[PDB]
Design an enzyme around this catalytic site. Sequence first.
Site, PDB file in Angstrom:
ATOM      1  N   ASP A  38       1.022  -1.298   0.022  1.00  0.00           N
ATOM      2  CA  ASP A  38      -0.095   0.056  -0.045  1.00  0.00           C
ATOM      3  C   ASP A  38       0.766   1.269  -0.076  1.00  0.00           C
ATOM      4  O   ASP A  38       0.394   2.171   0.412  1.00  0.00           O
ATOM      5  CB  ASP A  38      -1.100  -0.085   1.153  1.00  0.00           C
ATOM      6  N   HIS A 243      25.691   1.089 -16.160  1.00  0.00           N
ATOM      7  CA  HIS A 243      24.843   1.644 -15.374  1.00  0.00           C
ATOM      8  C   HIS A 243      24.930   0.729 -14.210  1.00  0.00           C
ATOM      9  O   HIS A 243      23.998  -0.051 -13.843  1.00  0.00           O
ATOM     10  CB  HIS A 243      23.240   1.441 -16.167  1.00  0.00           C
ATOM     11  N   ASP A 260      27.827   8.981 -12.120  1.00  0.00           N
ATOM     12  CA  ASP A 260      26.841   9.290 -13.378  1.00  0.00           C
ATOM     13  C   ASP A 260      25.469   9.831 -12.573  1.00  0.00           C
ATOM     14  O   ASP A 260      24.748   8.680 -12.052  1.00  0.00           O
ATOM     15  CB  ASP A 260      26.792   8.439 -14.608  1.00  0.00           C
ATOM     16  N   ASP A 271      22.804  15.865 -16.829  1.00  0.00           N
ATOM     17  CA  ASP A 271      23.628  14.202 -17.052  1.00  0.00           C
ATOM     18  C   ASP A 271      24.578  14.854 -16.795  1.00  0.00           C
ATOM     19  O   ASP A 271      25.333  15.044 -17.875  1.00  0.00           O
ATOM     20  CB  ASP A 271      23.210  13.899 -18.247  1.00  0.00           C
ATOM     21  N   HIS A 350      28.813   2.405 -26.230  1.00  0.00           N
ATOM     22  CA  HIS A 350      27.665   3.179 -26.330  1.00  0.00           C
ATOM     23  C   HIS A 350      27.635   4.563 -26.978  1.00  0.00           C
ATOM     24  O   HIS A 350      28.800   4.916 -27.648  1.00  0.00           O
ATOM     25  CB  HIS A 350      27.253   3.571 -24.914  1.00  0.00           C
ATOM     26  N   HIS A 354      22.854  11.908 -26.225  1.00  0.00           N
ATOM     27  CA  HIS A 354      21.442  11.419 -26.509  1.00  0.00           C
ATOM     28  C   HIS A 354      20.873  12.931 -26.060  1.00  0.00           C
ATOM     29  O   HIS A 354      21.714  14.071 -25.440  1.00  0.00           O
ATOM     30  CB  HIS A 354      20.920  10.491 -25.410  1.00  0.00           C
ATOM     31  N   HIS A 361      17.011  10.782 -21.293  1.00  0.00           N
ATOM     32  CA  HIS A 361      16.832  10.254 -22.733  1.00  0.00           C
ATOM     33  C   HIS A 361      15.784  10.854 -23.535  1.00  0.00           C
ATOM     34  O   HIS A 361      14.909  10.084 -23.597  1.00  0.00           O
ATOM     35  CB  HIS A 361      17.171   8.535 -22.658  1.00  0.00           C
ATOM     36  N   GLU A 383      28.983  12.477 -24.222  1.00  0.00           N
ATOM     37  CA  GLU A 383      29.649  11.667 -23.122  1.00  0.00           C
ATOM     38  C   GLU A 383      30.484  10.441 -23.551  1.00  0.00           C
ATOM     39  O   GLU A 383      29.956   9.130 -23.741  1.00  0.00           O
ATOM     40  CB  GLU A 383      28.370  11.131 -22.325  1.00  0.00           C
ATOM     41  N   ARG A 404      34.166   8.084 -17.831  1.00  0.00           N
ATOM     42  CA  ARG A 404      33.199   8.680 -18.657  1.00  0.00           C
ATOM     43  C   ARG A 404      33.292  10.196 -18.154  1.00  0.00           C
ATOM     44  O   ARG A 404      33.534  10.244 -17.182  1.00  0.00           O
ATOM     45  CB  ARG A 404      31.952   8.072 -18.455  1.00  0.00           C
ATOM     46  N   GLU A 406      30.959  13.279 -19.060  1.00  0.00           N
ATOM     47  CA  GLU A 406      29.492  13.642 -19.640  1.00  0.00           C
ATOM     48  C   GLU A 406      29.092  15.122 -19.346  1.00  0.00           C
ATOM     49  O   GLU A 406      29.335  15.489 -18.238  1.00  0.00           O
ATOM     50  CB  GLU A 406      28.288  12.644 -19.428  1.00  0.00           C
TER      51      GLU A 406
END
Length: 440
Positions: A38, A243, A260, A271, A350, A354, A361, A383, A404, A406
């Site tokens: 609930d 991810h 990230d 991002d 990748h 984006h 995205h 990125e 990375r 970005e």
Amino acid sequence: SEISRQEFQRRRQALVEQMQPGSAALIFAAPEVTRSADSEYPYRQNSDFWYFTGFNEPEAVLVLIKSDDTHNHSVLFNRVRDLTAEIWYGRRLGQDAAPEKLGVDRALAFSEINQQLYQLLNGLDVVYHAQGEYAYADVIVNSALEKLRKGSRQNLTAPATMIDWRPVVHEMRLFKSPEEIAVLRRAGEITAMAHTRAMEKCRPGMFEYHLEGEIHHEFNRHGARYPSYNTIVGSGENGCILHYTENECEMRDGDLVLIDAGCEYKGYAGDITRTFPVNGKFTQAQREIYDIVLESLETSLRLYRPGTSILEVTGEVVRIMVSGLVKLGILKGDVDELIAQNAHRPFFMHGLSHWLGLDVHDVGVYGQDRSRILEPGMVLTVEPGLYIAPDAEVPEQYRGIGIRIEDDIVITETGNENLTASVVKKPEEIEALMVAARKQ
Ligand SMILES: [Mn+2]
Ligand SMILES: [Mn+2]
């Protein structure tokens, strides 16, 4: 900053303008979602619905009716005000304050939708509906049309033409207005401040999730209650998992940490990805992989402008990655040959960019292999990254390195504006930042 009431009206008119005469656009709000039993998750409004209304409530349906080239009105279906439901859960808008608050013409009760909707559709030729988006929406719209098809004796007619408005609406969301760009600009500063914070708080021994905490708290401190997506805090080998969201491991000295994380501010996403040494000092091996990724980013930032595409800039990046990977012994062969055989894929698997907007995205047509020509108004991420698997057959010192870096940008008339450049990315700057923080 935020979207004024003038702007939502402007968006509603922009869509109506593209509508055929004798039609209606049905835009549904997002359903509530269970987290456990609930218990429900913090409500998140459907991005398309929000785009036209800015109304953060469940069981709402915006109907835009267009009679002709200059005659159009709107009907909003939303929850009826109720005092028991308002003592328990929060205050509702109700049908009375709705027309003024949301700039709509008429506001009916959601409980009356099945008795009302078919009356609103009856006699029209076209109905714009995002068939399949929501199951509750599909039931409602279908029975409104079945009532109309089945009631010819009652002189009722159903629009024979159904058109998906997502392409049209998403094509609109693709180009940001100055108001939106101003919101996104703030989303960038807030996310940047958070990333700077994590870097300043990071210490060997702390867990990955601890940096998740510092990031989320800083989002909150500026009025961005929720992240636009689940925060990635991958240190060491974890940084090789794109991810990685478990953020359960203890950050060790000597390893790198890839964060990230992005804030959701007034419905817009931020991002940002920043990779840095858990101990504040890059090793030579770490620095070697980092430089290739940083050069890809800096070059792409320089390249991005109207006329080019994501495909075009990605080529320049692949080139940089291959060149750099050969020079270190990670790749072996002729640069142009390795490029032609896409030899960087096992390390950079990748896309480079984006679309960015109400959804990280974001919506909007990319074109085959993301070849669409960039125009002012388009907002995207930049990125580049390199992920050397722990068991990769390359010199040992590069194994288990994930990096990375970005940034979010807006395509301007001459180039682009970097919304996330307030958080350092050059190694001397990152090291200087961490060293300054570690004094205190
Ligand atoms: Mn991204
Ligand atoms: Mn990201």
